[PDB]
């Protein structure tokens, strides 16, 4: 009695109807990429392909069980990883040039080794960073168990409310900006993990400079 | 409206029903937890501070029992502990405090109409009627609060500098 092939093991009157309701499809999410559909014949335009990419079909694994996450949760996690990786790749690129904050007797921000850069700082300096991340990731996360089971109502995936007003009013341009976000995030994820892999095993990224 | 803080109104639980109600509760602690426990604790602290203040003052102005060590009230605690009388008084107050466990349980559960800080000590029927009870309870709680602050000042001055009844 729902999209799932099986009724949820959660009982009736205590969640079953909440899990087993209709859920939005992957096609209604701004993630399609023209580059994958960049070949003669079939193809897309404006940086978006006509269909999304999912060879392993992780998006529609909810139909097997509600243990697996919903596409809302997956988009939330994708945007989170992309944003974190964008900040991370920008940080390593800026730090490796040698630019650093002034410092004083107590703190010395002079370290180009991005892997061991946090280790040089005093306990307080990185403690504040980790505490801020811990509080914010945990305060901004409300209704994420709702995005897992699929109820994109209270929370939109990726909309923390930070600067959401600058999104254009036109649907086409808003989707264009969201797609630019997703593409840059995915590129930054690949870049930061490639630099990390190059560091751990040399030669993983031949174009490396760090 | 709260009288102590005239920029905001008093909580729902401070209603005059209790003695010494100036509408002072900026933190809503008595709205967060039962107010009878608060009043009983306030009374107990104040009585202990009243007796502590007068005892400190007398021991500093020479008032000792026969067979007692002539020592300032600052070191009176240590010397009385060494003598052992401290533990006897500990047992004496512990009896009343366990009876106070029972009394507080009955008060909060409503098994009896016990007022907070009430052990039914009225040899002279000083408050056998309602208006006498209101007046004498307001006067006590005032003395409780004042002596609490006064003894905090005294003992501290004594532990900080000097000695004697004045400080």
């Amino acid at each position: 009695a729902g999209p799932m092939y099986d009724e949820p093991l959660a009982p009736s009157g205590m969640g079953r109807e909440f899990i087993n309701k209709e859920r939005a499809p992957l096609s209604s999410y701004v993630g399609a990429s023209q580059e994958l559909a960049a070949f003669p014949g079939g193809g897309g335009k404006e940086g978006m392909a006509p269909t999304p990419w999912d060879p392993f079909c992780f998006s529609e694994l909810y139909k097997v069980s509600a243990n697996n996450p919903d596409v809302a949760w997956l988009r939330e996690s994708e945007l989170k990883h992309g944003r974190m990786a964008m900040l991370a790749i920008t940080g390593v690129m800026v730090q490796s040039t040698g630019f650093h904050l002034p410092g004083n007797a107590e703190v010395s921000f002079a370290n180009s080794d991005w892997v061991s850069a946090p280790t040089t700082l005093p306990p307080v300096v990185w403690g504040q960073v980790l505490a801020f991340v811990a509080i914010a990731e945990g305060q901004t996360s409300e209704g994420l168990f709702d995005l897992w089971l699929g109820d994109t109502s209270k929370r939109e995936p990726g909309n923390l409310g930070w600067g959401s007003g600058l999104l254009s009013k036109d649907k086409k341009a808003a989707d264009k900006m969201r797609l630019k976000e997703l593409k840059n995030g995915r590129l930054a994820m690949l870049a930061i993990m490639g630099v990390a892999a190059n560091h751990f095993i040399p030669g993983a990224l031949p174009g490396c400079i760090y | 409206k709260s009288q102590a803080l005239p920029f905001l109104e008093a909580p729902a639980k401070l209603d005059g029903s209790m003695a010494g109600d100036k509408g002072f509760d900026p933190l809503n602690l008595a709205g967060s937890f039962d107010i009878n426990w608060m009043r009983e604790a306030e009374l107990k602290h104040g009585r202990i501070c009243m007796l502590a203040w007068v005892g400190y003052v007398a021991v500093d102005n020479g008032f000792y029992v026969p067979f007692a060590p002539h020592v300032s009230s600052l070191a009176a605690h240590d010397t009385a502990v060494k003598s052992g009388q401290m533990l006897f008084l500990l047992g004496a107050v512990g009896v009343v405090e366990a009876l106070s466990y029972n009394a507080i349980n009955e008060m909060m559960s409503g098994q009896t109409d016990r007022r907070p800080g009430d052990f039914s000590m009225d040899p002279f029927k000083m408050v056998d009627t309602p208006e006498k009870a209101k007046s004498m309870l307001e006067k006590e709680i005032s003395h409780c609060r004042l002596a609490m602050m006064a003894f905090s000042g005294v003992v501290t001055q004594s532990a900080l500098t000097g000695h004697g009844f004045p400080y």
Binding site: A10, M14, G15, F145 | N102, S109
Partner: protein
């Protein structure tokens, strides 16, 4: 006295969200306090675990004098 906890209340209101563990631990207080066999089983399981623990710990950390050299005991 008033202070303390109610095991019935604790068990009844320990239920995770969205019915993960069904209705939770509702009725377990009633079944345990009514059935002596469940209590006996819990006690026997705990005591068997404790007996295995003492067996595993006496040889590893002997507490009695000269027992380590007494191999038969």
């Amino acid at each position: 006295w008033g202070i303390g906890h109610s095991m019935k209340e604790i068990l009844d209101a320990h239920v995770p969200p969205k019915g993960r563990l069904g209705s939770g631990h509702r009725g377990l207080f009633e079944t345990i306090t009514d059935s002596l066999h469940m209590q006996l089983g819990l006690a026997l399981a705990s005591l068997g675990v404790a007996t295995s623990l003492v067996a595993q710990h006496m040889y590893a950390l002997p507490s009695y004098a000269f027992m380590a050299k007494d191999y038969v005991t």
